[PDB]
Amino acid sequence: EAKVTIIYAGLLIPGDGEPLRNAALVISDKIIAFVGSEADIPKKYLRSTQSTHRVPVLMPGLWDCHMHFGGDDDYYNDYTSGLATHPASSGARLARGCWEALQNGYTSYRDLAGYGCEVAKAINDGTIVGPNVYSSGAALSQTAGHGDIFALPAGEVLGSYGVMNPRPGYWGAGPLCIADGVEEVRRAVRLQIRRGAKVIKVMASGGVMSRDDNPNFAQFSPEELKVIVEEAARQNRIVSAHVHGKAGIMAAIKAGCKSLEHVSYADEEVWELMKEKGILYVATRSVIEIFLASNGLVKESWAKLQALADSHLKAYQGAIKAGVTIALGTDTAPGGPTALELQFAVERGGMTPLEAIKAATANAPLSVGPQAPLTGQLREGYEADVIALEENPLEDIKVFQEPKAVTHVWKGGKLFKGPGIGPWGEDARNPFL
Amino acid sequence: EAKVTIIYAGLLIPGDGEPLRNAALVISDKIIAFVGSEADIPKKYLRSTQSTHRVPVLMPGLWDCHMHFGGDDDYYNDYTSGLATHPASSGARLARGCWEALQNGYTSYRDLAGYGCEVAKAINDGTIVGPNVYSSGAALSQTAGHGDIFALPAGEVLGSYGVMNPRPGYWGAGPLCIADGVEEVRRAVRLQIRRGAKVIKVMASGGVMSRDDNPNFAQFSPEELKVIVEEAARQNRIVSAHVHGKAGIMAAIKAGCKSLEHVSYADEEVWELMKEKGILYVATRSVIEIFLASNGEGLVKESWAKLQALADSHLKAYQGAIKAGVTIALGTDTAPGGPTALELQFAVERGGMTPLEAIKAATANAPLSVGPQAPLTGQLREGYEADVIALEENPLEDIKVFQEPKAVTHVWKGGKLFKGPGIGPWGEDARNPFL
Amino acid sequence: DEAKVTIIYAGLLIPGDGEPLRNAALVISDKIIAFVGSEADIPKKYLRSTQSTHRVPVLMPGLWDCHMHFGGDDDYYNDYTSGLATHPASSGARLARGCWEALQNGYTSYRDLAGYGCEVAKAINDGTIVGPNVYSSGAALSQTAGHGDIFALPAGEVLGSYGVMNPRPGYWGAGPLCIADGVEEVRRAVRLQIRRGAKVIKVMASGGVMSRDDNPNFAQFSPEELKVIVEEAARQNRIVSAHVHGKAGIMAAIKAGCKSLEHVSYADEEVWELMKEKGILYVATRSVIEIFLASNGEGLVKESWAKLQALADSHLKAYQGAIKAGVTIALGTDTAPGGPTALELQFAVERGGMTPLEAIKAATANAPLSVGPQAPLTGQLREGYEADVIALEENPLEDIKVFQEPKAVTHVWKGGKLFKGPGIGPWGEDARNPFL
Amino acid sequence: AGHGDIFALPAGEVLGSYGVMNPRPGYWGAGPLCIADGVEEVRRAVRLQIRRGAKVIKVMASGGVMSRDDNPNFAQFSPEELKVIVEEAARQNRIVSAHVHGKAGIMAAIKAGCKSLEHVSYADEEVWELMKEKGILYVATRSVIE
Missing domain, CATH: 3.20.20.140 (Metal-dependent hydrolases)
Structure with a gap:
């Protein structure tokens, strides 16, 4: 069964297009399943989601x-x-x-x-x-x-x-x-x-x-x-x-x-x-x-x-x-x-x-x-390489120069940085054991 | 000026010798400056210490x-x-x-x-x-x-x-x-x-x-x-x-x-x-x-x-x-x-x-x-290199304690803390070396 | 920070491509030739600023x-x-x-x-x-x-x-x-x-x-x-x-x-x-x-x-x-x-x-x-060209074999630096032992 | 891995340049340095310098002064190699000069039959006497230290 994550974003910067306010993005396994307004999240994902995140700013990796x-x-x-x-x-x-x-x-x-x-x-x-x-x-x-x-x-x-x-x-x-x-x-x-x-x-x-x-x-x-x-x-x-x-x-x-x-x-x-x-x-x-x-x-x-x-x-x-x-x-x-x-x-x-x-x-x-x-x-069908920021980079492009300002990092749908997540990413195990 | 750390230990396993209860170890820069009972820490270190730790068990790396x-x-x-x-x-x-x-x-x-x-x-x-x-x-x-x-x-x-x-x-x-x-x-x-x-x-x-x-x-x-x-x-x-x-x-x-x-x-x-x-x-x-x-097979x-x-x-x-x-x-x-x-x-x-x-x-x-x-x-001896680890549990009671990495709470190598509460993955005061 | 200026007065100046000039002068500023022409026409700023002057019978390009x-x-x-x-x-x-x-x-x-x-x-x-x-x-x-x-x-x-x-x-x-x-x-x-x-x-x-x-x-x-x-x-x-x-x-x-x-x-x-x-x-x-x-x-x-x-x-x-x-x-x-x-x-x-x-x-x-x-x-020997300049004791236009006597070449400038001349040692002006 | 080796370069480049195996075009055997390992190779090493007209033979018999890669306190070459090197030089009426700092190196160079020692940084009473006895030249090179 598919692993589903809902991320709510105060501001969503899709990469090519106008940013969206109060948006949401759904990750299903390795791909982006949905992007759009908070209100429009397909209900099937609201039922099936393993975890949800709420971040001020979301954008592509x-x-x-x-x-x-x-x-x-x-x-x-x-x-x-x-x-x-x-x-x-x-x-x-x-x-x-x-x-x-x-x-x-x-x-x-x-x-x-x-x-x-x-x-x-x-x-x-x-x-x-x-x-x-x-x-x-x-x-x-x-x-x-x-x-x-x-x-x-x-x-x-x-x-x-x-x-x-x-x-x-x-x-x-x-x-x-x-x-x-x-x-x-x-x-x-x-x-x-x-x-x-x-x-x-x-x-x-x-x-x-x-x-x-x-x-x-x-x-x-x-x-x-x-x-x-x-x-x-x-x-x-x-x-x-x-x-x-x-x-x-x-x-x-x-x-x-x-x-x-x-x-x-x-x-x-x-x-x-x-x-x-x-x-x-x-x-x-x-x-x-x-x-x-x-x-x-x-x-x-x-x-x-x-x-x-x-x-x-x-x-x-x-x-x-x-x-x-x-x-x-x-x-x-x-x-x-x-x-x-x-x-x-x-x-x-x-x-x-x-x-x-x-x-x-x-x-x-x-x-x-x-x-x-x-x-x-950040588009439906694209790879789930997604990052969350604490502050709006459109107001100051130098925000990216503070790594602490990048709070969440998804690569291929997998969380490699985020609150509670260790240095080697989610469910990391020592590969030499 | 030398960087001094005092570590108090419920049990101190020196490596070769009988373990010591309620002991202390002082690190000065890269070396061990003192080992012995808590009560015997030279006062100069009590005065000059940058930080102190208190752990149940201390031993050599x-x-x-x-x-x-x-x-x-x-x-x-x-x-x-x-x-x-x-x-x-x-x-x-x-x-x-x-x-x-x-x-x-x-x-x-x-x-x-x-x-x-x-x-x-x-x-x-x-x-x-x-x-x-x-x-x-x-x-x-x-x-x-x-x-x-x-x-x-x-x-x-x-x-x-x-x-x-x-x-x-x-x-x-x-x-x-x-x-x-x-x-x-x-x-x-x-x-x-x-x-x-x-x-x-x-x-x-x-x-x-x-x-x-x-x-x-x-x-x-x-x-x-x-x-x-x-x-x-x-x-x-x-x-x-x-x-x-x-x-x-x-x-x-x-x-x-x-x-x-x-x-x-x-x-x-x-x-x-x-x-x-x-x-x-x-x-x-x-x-x-x-x-x-x-x-x-x-x-x-x-x-x-x-x-x-x-x-x-x-x-x-x-x-x-x-x-x-x-x-x-x-x-x-x-x-x-x-x-x-x-x-x-x-x-x-x-x-x-x-x-x-x-x-x-x-x-x-x-x-x-x-x-x-x-x-x-x-x-864990005076004049030896400050390669020191702290444990949550007494390994003398169960040698398998070492098989849980979480049980190793503190790791000093050459006097530098590479693992410990509040310490990031690359050790204390780690900076991105590529900047 | 100041430019190094040298004035060379020449009885005859052979520019390299062009008619020779009698009673001419050439100015070197650092590595380059700053002026060439008649003695009378040397811009006064060089007459003021010159570190050293030479007078030679014949001047030409290196x-x-x-x-x-x-x-x-x-x-x-x-x-x-x-x-x-x-x-x-x-x-x-x-x-x-x-x-x-x-x-x-x-x-x-x-x-x-x-x-x-x-x-x-x-x-x-x-x-x-x-x-x-x-x-x-x-x-x-x-x-x-x-x-x-x-x-x-x-x-x-x-x-x-x-x-x-x-x-x-x-x-x-x-x-x-x-x-x-x-x-x-x-x-x-x-x-x-x-x-x-x-x-x-x-x-x-x-x-x-x-x-x-x-x-x-x-x-x-x-x-x-x-x-x-x-x-x-x-x-x-x-x-x-x-x-x-x-x-x-x-x-x-x-x-x-x-x-x-x-x-x-x-x-x-x-x-x-x-x-x-x-x-x-x-x-x-x-x-x-x-x-x-x-x-x-043979x-x-x-x-x-x-x-x-x-x-x-x-x-x-x-x-x-x-x-x-x-x-x-x-x-x-x-x-x-x-x-x-x-x-x-x-x-x-x-x-x-x-x-x-x-x-x-x-x-x-x-x-x-x-x-x-x-x-x-x-x-x-032209303004703006590199200061590779030699002086001769005799006029080579009267005898092209003059170049076969190295003593007849009295002064040698390369890139404005004097490598041969009266008072100048074998390795050129201000030479120092590079191995000290 | 001796004092003549260029540790910052990988080993194939250095031994390709200065080793006594693999003869090839490009002034093989005629550089500032010669790497040789074992009795067989050290014979050729000495001979390749005589070939060029060398009037003395120089060996690295301990580490370099900077204690970075090799260690000045430790001897370099085996006594077997050093003896052969001295014998090879001697047959063509050359003596060997040995770069030595630590006493281990100094003593190995003396034992082997070297007749000139350089730096000689840890020469003590025993060394001085030996050098007098055997007629070995002391070349301090104090300038380097200074």
């Missing part, structure tokens, strides 16, 4: 569409720690991160480089808890691309992450994958699917820093990018492209990528193309804001960074104004400061708090294309 | 001296899962395990095969919580030894775990290490020290199951075992030896191993040798009890009779060692967060220990399991 | 050589075997002397076309040593059995060292040479040079000048590979320089999109027009031809020597023809750092038929075209 499941040791300060950190160390750290994410009301994460596939196994067998993870597996990069570890010699990097020379040692299952040429990129995409990747991520331009590779220059050939998109597409994945400079943006669009990250030099032409082709914009404004707070760096390097920060701001604001479909991503480790991205959507992008919430809920599953279930909205 | 930090996927049923499971999956699972261990009052673990060194890093930087982990890194095995994965062809296993052919992919850092000959075995030990291993583990006889290798037969040559012991000793580690048959037990003793596991065919000669040379006995009776409960009738014969020998060996006064510590042979409390039960109900002796074997004696790598710990 | 190789080889093997066998630590040490010598001769920029320029530039840029601005190709790219191949060694050794398959320990992908075969491999080949910081890409597009193993008349790499190489370079804003002798190789390099050609020994009217049309740089490296002409068929079979002379003659006609046709030219020597680069100016005049002023243009103003979009504004 939050997504972050740009996470990286790294779990690095704190020793090396560049991408060397990705290579040097033993993945057992990483997984342990990612477990905390995933716990923290869920306690903050994040019920889905799109991992774009790292061990999300491997860690998801420990979430799905119930050993640990966390959001739904949609992982790219390794980010794909060309040699001398943004995924490359320039400070290491090339043999070490390609021995670790290349798609030639199969060998013992979890070959093909790291945070990055280096491939050069049409032949190698086919295997590259396939190796991520192999680990269970639900999205594909490419480096389609240089990194934001400008020391080794250049953010203004495109990465991968159009021939490789097209093959990568076709490979993903055959298994119903879309490709997400790291892009800053317009060269890279346009190459990623031409190739068929359906999600773009950073998009720092998006202009009017880009916005129109992204609307036309249904391409998702994920700004990751957090990462820009961090280095702006750093304030420097050589004086010319810093001026370059500020110039890019300004372009990035204009690009984001322009895309919002032009009606490009947007989702939110932070570019951080699990349990990182993802809530800040909602703040920046409002205070930098110029979104309303309601639009910001849409970008983090209703629009977010577009980030994984056909791999998305019906989710991200 | 518990050790388990035979854990394995595997975190395997549930897919393959033999040692294939150790190879096939991505270590990121393993680490994640071990994080839950370590949390559970600490919530049960286990503040130290000796990991004898797996990723303890690698997971300890996430504990020591405060990303996760868990016991003090003393890890062997990989268990060392000969080809066709107990560490070998017989169902896989040999190239795959030695490509993964051998000490030749360095390569990308975390070479030398798995749950198992295959090495053959004096030359290879030197590297084998060194590769574990490289990871931070605080003990060395060898397979010195066949596995308990008797299908591939034979528990009655010794493993490694005496030449290899001696080198292994010498390699460990030079970096102040001792070696723990998996041994069942007497051949393996005696070879391990001769070589200089200072801790023996299972020890299923220990007889009078073995007990005396172990006393004489100061060798620790870790029975792991839990593992034997699991397959006894299984009842030989899905085994050949003769294979089951062999198992029962070994279970009986193992029982006599354990009882005999307790009776002969061999120094004993407790180990379960299970994953972190596993049913370690059961081993205390078996120490009393199978071994014939008093509850007080059982507690000694899980506290005061347990650091002997890691030899010179042990700090002063495992006892 | 010199470029567009064909260097940062090899540093041990003197043991006489062919390309030394490139493989020489430990790169030995090489780097030798290259440090070479770079010091270059700068003392007024060479403030070098285009390295095979070797460790990228790796050595790091020691120049952190100030441990001194040298020119280095624009390096990293490894020269070659096909198997191409001009970069070491034919005297068996093929497994050469491709184990320089191939783009089989990543391994030991500074894989970072040698003087890179062997790649096929479109797939050549993509990685280009990318591995960019990885080391290469600011240009170099390909072997024909056989070597010695007609011993490979043949200078025959093209190297397929057109498909060459196009991919050019596209790969272009995506990161590099151009490709092509080693070409025979017309087959010249034409294939041009068709593929290469923007700089070296040697170009069989360039004829059709080639000159194409190079003008497409803006392709001509780097003759006449020095290398002149060296073996001076050898005089232990060569008579027919091998006749072949070499025939090529030397074609090379001369090609060069003269390109100058006469108005192809854009820059100077390169094809030598080690600190080599006899000044000779190339002599040959530009005495073999090519350039005026001394045109020769200087080819070694200054035109030279940054050698690295395409990777060039800053440099190679001219």
